[PDB]
Amino acid sequence: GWEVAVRPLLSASYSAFEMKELPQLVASVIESESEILHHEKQYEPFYSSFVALSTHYITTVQLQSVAAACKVLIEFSLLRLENPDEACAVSQKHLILLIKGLCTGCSRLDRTEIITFTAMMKSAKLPQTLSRQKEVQMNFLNQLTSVFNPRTVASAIKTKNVFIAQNVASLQELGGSEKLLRVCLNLPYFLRYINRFQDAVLANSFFIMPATVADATAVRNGFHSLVIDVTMALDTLSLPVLEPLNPSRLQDVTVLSLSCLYAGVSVATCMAILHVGSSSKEDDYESDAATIVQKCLEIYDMIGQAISSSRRAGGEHYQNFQLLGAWCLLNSLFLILNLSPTALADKGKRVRDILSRTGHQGFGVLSVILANHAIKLLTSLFQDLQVTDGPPAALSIMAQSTSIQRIQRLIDSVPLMNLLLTLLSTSYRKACV
Amino acid sequence: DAVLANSFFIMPATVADATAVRNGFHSLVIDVTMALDTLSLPVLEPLNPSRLQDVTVLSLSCLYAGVSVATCMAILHVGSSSKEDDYESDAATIVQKCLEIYDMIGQAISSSRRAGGEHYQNFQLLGAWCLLNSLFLILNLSPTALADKGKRVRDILSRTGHQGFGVLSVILANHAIKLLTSLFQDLQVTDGPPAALSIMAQSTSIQRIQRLIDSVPLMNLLLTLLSTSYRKACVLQRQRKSRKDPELFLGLASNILNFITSSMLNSRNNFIRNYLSVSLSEHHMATLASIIKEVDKDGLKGSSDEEFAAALYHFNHSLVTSDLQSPNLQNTLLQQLGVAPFSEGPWPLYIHPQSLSVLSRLLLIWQHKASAQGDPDVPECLKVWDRFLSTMKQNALQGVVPSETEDLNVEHLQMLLLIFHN
């Protein structure tokens, strides 16, 4: 039965996990494998919560069976992250943290959620409401059929290392890298940012629309979903799912990272506009803006590091990545520093229109952070340049160009010297004030 | 010329030509030292395509020179004071400096902001190609037959005792195995042309590995190095009771075996598994059986022996379990081991642990497959039980008291009982 199968988790929910309770849990997970992936709607939350508790208790601490069970759970979480159904007891975010935790040292789930998971455990109805020789022979057959590594990869650290190696091998076997990247690309909230980046790169111009103060407020009040999305995307990108950098995979990765940087730039512009136009809610808003911009920069840096060190993408792609990042950051800085105090802000109730048509109470910590990252990209590019008036370097990761072409494209986008002197003056004035 | 002709050239030629190439080793030493010092300066950063071509030309030619001096020293040793000691020290120094130059150039290419992963892959491919061709050439040296009758690699392949080898061979094999494991780990994550041997070429990992296979039959070469290295290590260990120590050769053997297990046996790719299934031969099983007999007869000796035993155990069981060897190959292995289920002599009542492990693994796999499919009882198990009973009955009739290492260790009895239960 299933009641006796879930009994060890019910007993252990009030304590740690007894060592003697693990092998039968593994046996039950392997035995029901044929059914776990195929279920009706009303049993689904029960099985989701059971999987959550099982994974949690496995990660808190014969290796072949554990690896098989972990592979089964990873497969379950994978197709649960692909489909996700409305009535899933565990949302997509906790599935992402669970998959990460099985590949790491179990520092994702918290008690505040497993209490609700056990409550749902009790409140859910069984499939068949919750409110020695056979196992040895199976283990013998499992050890006989396949050979565990062991040494191809003090005691606690090596057991943890082999556990992580087995788990990541199982994850890669299912091809979860492509599925995770696909699920991260077609997010319901990053979609607008990705589309905006596509239009900006196609039209050669830079777009930001916090627009007026009212539009800035409208963009606000939905910031918490953006925080959740950026956190989950960062956790997904922290997993080793990026190694086979095919050209299409490269394009997808740069699209995702650059759109995330675009989102950070946009929230920075929104906060600056709000401050120019002008409790606990405002403090929450500013803390959330700081968190999202920091996470966006972290994602950008992680993607850049992955691109630079990869054995399929080399120096040219890293240079193009740095050029795109610097272009976005510099255009953003020019836009935010061109904000009027009251004139254009009130009369408004792009960068090409601003250039065609052509008080520094904006700025802030976000502006400083963006300027620092832009200056790092710029010094890297200029150090590269140091060692025929052609076209500006194409804004694609697969393009070929020289350093002079990239610098000339940056100059064509924005007058750099005047901009730099403007930020220097404004920053010193703010510091002295 | 070698890259243009798709072939590999080394001409130490005979002993006289080897001596003629020698006696000029001091100039080569001074040249490699000055080249290494020049390459140590920061004068490599702007890697234009032409500069890349020049750098790879220089580094690969230096590696070629190290390979050539290694071949010359090996030929001199096969053919056969302070001068000889100076010559061997010079050879060691020049090969070490050549390897250092190659590694420095490779690291510079990998970390450069103008040359990326593809160029590093091509660099590794060229290095591995040169190293493997050199190893094949040196390990195919004849003792006296072709050496005296001679008074390339394509002619050798067209026309088709191991007192050569040495420390230089071990170092070259180690570097080649490092390049090979890097390339195969790259592969892991349409029968086209082999990958071009140019630093600017575009190719997939399958293409590079297939080019390496085309140049030299890899599996036979690797097994030959494993066998020769273990033989030299065991001979040196017997004589004892860098060259004077046997742990180096034992480590090389363990490393090559571990490479074979991790990169090929556990590989998921279909093409490499097909190649492994095609390229396994009965002579390889005979060599493996002789290695097993040596390791079980010698017994536990030292820590390096423990590591080599672990590697051999892992290789044996991975080969047995992962369904590449055809059944006749398994029968050949058992027959060579002397524990063939269809033999006619008395059943050996004492089985050494390694042979017992492999035999039990094979028999239990057969029994499990037969039970799962529905086949009636496998004739091999019935035959082994019958032969055990007949031998034991004969010994009972003769009233013979065996020795402590002669009949019926306990693990053998447990294994037979487990067979009986199924």
Author numbering:
A (entry chain B): 28 to 88, 96 to 162, 166 to 168, 185 to 206, 230 to 354, 364 to 434, 443 to 451, 465 to 493, ...
B (entry chain A): 275 to 354, 364 to 434, 443 to 451, 465 to 493, 502 to 553, 640 to 820
Sentences from the paper on this structure:
Among the >600 human ubiquitin ligases, UBR4 plays a particularly important PQC role, being an essential and conserved E3/E4 ligase found across eukaryotes. Aside from teaming up with various ubiquitin ligases, UBR4 activity is linked to two specific cofactors: calcium-binding protein calmodulin (CALM1) and KCMF1 (13, 16, 17, 20, 21). Our data show that the evolutionarily conserved UBR4 complex forms a megadalton E4 arena, in which inward-facing ZZ-DZB domains of KCMF1 act not as E3 ligases but as substrate receptors. The architecture of the E4 megacomplex is conserved across eukaryotes, but species-specific adaptations allow UBR4 to perform its precisely tuned quality-control function in diverse cellular environments.
We reconstituted the human E4 complex by co-expressing UBR4, KCMF1 and CALM1 in insect cells and purifying the ternary complex via a tag on UBR4. Focused cryo-EM classification and refinement yielded density maps that resolved all folded regions of the human UBR4 complex (HsUBR42/KCMF12/CALM12), except the flexible C-terminal extension bearing the catalytic hemi-RING E3 module. Two UBR4 molecules dimerize through two remote, structurally different interfaces to form a large ring-shaped assembly. The first interface is composed by the N-terminal domain, involving extensive contacts between adjacent Armadillo repeats.
